[PDB]
């Protein structure tokens, strides 16, 4: 255990608010009443200060509760945690906003043990939560290799984790919204010289692809800044290729999710995803489509847009490594232009290449790219 300060809270909040971010704060679940019931006193204090300060903040309780026993030699069944969540819910409603949110229970991924705990928790506590949170990592960082990052079989395991979660949630709280609460490439602080590279982007972009297509409403990346190799921003506050990928995604990809698929249909290496174009982007209209694609082949592939889209004008946003280290590189170029900050207060333009109208979509070996179909005029979008 360690103690933290009001000083810590103020900074953490201010950083969220000045960054245009809704902070969610996880609370300590291992503080316990003699009978193994959750003592609410520390949070109560913290809630009051935050009430005192007028901070609009959202809350979680516990982390990886499936692991308390190995992690602290205290076993809490879900029911118990469910009661505990009800108590937390009592407290937030009594306090200043009370139209403020609560999520949980942040259990690790579908494990045959972890499903039991989540099910029992959603029976008891499914009622108070505004979203369901789980975690996912692909590999153990200490033993993760470079081929893994390029292995479509590794990517696809993610799907059964997802199917298994919705299997549990539909049994208890259908219509309840599901969130990837903490997630990444490799656990144990990341795979060294892999989790912080261009190669990490095959996993991250596919994770966002699969999640959007399978009903995950929010995906929370471990981490933005920190010790772990899986940071979006490094030790010296430099953006890593995942940060540049993540920017591009937010600016280009919409909330309305669609579907694309390959007519070939055998090899697992050409992954494609389709959303409405993020309307907010000043370059586009509504009705335009945003296609993102990963190529895990060791040669270039050229995609053909289908009727009646075969003859439309397309902006291409191709990402490839900045050498000499290639896929293990920590710099990345967009359409052949290295991406860097202009200075410490200013991001550069992300510039497209307007493609030819009717041209097929070149996607080179081990690359990922976005393509915005301009003048698509789709009605759902």
């Amino acid at each position: 255990n360690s103690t933290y300060s009001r000083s810590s809270v103020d900074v953490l909040y201010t950083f969220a608010n000045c960054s245009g971010l809704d902070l969610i704060f996880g609370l300590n679940a291992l503080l316990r009443t003699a009978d193994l019931q959750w003592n609410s006193s520390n949070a109560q204090l913290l809630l009051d200060y935050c009430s005192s300060k007028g901070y609009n903040i959202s809350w979680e309780l516990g982390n990886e509760p499936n692991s308390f026993l190995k992690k602290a030699d205290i076993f809490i069944n879900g029911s118990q945690l469910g009661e505990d969540f009800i108590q937390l819910h009592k407290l937030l409603r009594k306090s200043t906003f009370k139209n403020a949110k609560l999520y949980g229970p942040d259990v690790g991924q579908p494990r045959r043990k972890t499903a039991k705990m989540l099910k029992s928790f959603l029976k008891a506590g499914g009622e108070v939560i505004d979203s369901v949170t789980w975690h996912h990592y692909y590999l153990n960082g200490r033993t993760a290799t470079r081929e893994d990052f390029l292995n479509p079989d590794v990517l696809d395991i993610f799907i059964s984790s997802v199917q298994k979660v919705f299997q549990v949630v539909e049994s208890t709280r259908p219509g309840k919204k599901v969130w990837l609460g903490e997630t990444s490439s490799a656990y144990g602080g990341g795979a060294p010289l892999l989790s912080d590279t261009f190669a990490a982007g095959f996993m991250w972009l596919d994770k966002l692809g699969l999640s959007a297509r399978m009903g995950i409403e929010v995906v929370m990346r471990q981490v933005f800044f920190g010790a772990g190799n899986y940071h979006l921003v490094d030790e010296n506050f430099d953006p890593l290729p995942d940060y540049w990928l993540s920017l591009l995604f937010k600016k280009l990809v919409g909330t309305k999710v669609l579907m694309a698929s390959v007519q070939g249909s055998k090899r697992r290496k050409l992954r494609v995803y389709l959303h409405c174009t993020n309307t907010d982007n000043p370059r586009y209209k509504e009705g335009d489509l945003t296609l993102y694609a990963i190529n895990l082949h060791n040669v270039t592939k050229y995609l053909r847009l289908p009727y009646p889209f075969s003859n439309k004008q397309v902006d291409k946003y191709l990402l490839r490594p900045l050498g000499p280290h290639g896929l293990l590189s920590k710099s990345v170029q967009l359409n052949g232009l290295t991406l860097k900050m202009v200075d410490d207060q200013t991001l550069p333009p992300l510039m497209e290449k307007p493609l030819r109208p009717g041209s097929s979509l070149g996607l080179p070996a081990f690359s990922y790219s976005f393509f915005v179909i301009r003048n698509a005029k789709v009605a759902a979008c």
Partner: protein
């Protein structure tokens, strides 16, 4: 051969995600660092975080169950 044709489904939206879909976390262990004050005050880092708005910032992690609020600490 290197030409692949794609199928699309554009009739209606299959899922609706949050404008905050792509979100991030700060690990609770970052509060065991002595440089917490300095790192989050960085204007460069805040700039990067603003390019990711709108989004949720989740402060938690394994260390969530080992932080004790102390009112007499600053």
């Amino acid at each position: 051969q290197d030409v692949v044709d794609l199928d699309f489904f554009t009739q209606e939206p299959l899922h609706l995600v949050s404008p905050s879909f792509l979100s991030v976390t700060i690990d609770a262990n970052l509060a065991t660092d002595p440089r917490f004050l300095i790192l989050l005050g960085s204007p460069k880092l805040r700039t990067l975080a603003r390019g990711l708005s709108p989004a949720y910032l989740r402060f938690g992690g394994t260390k969530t169950d080992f932080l004790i609020f102390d009112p007499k600490k600053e």
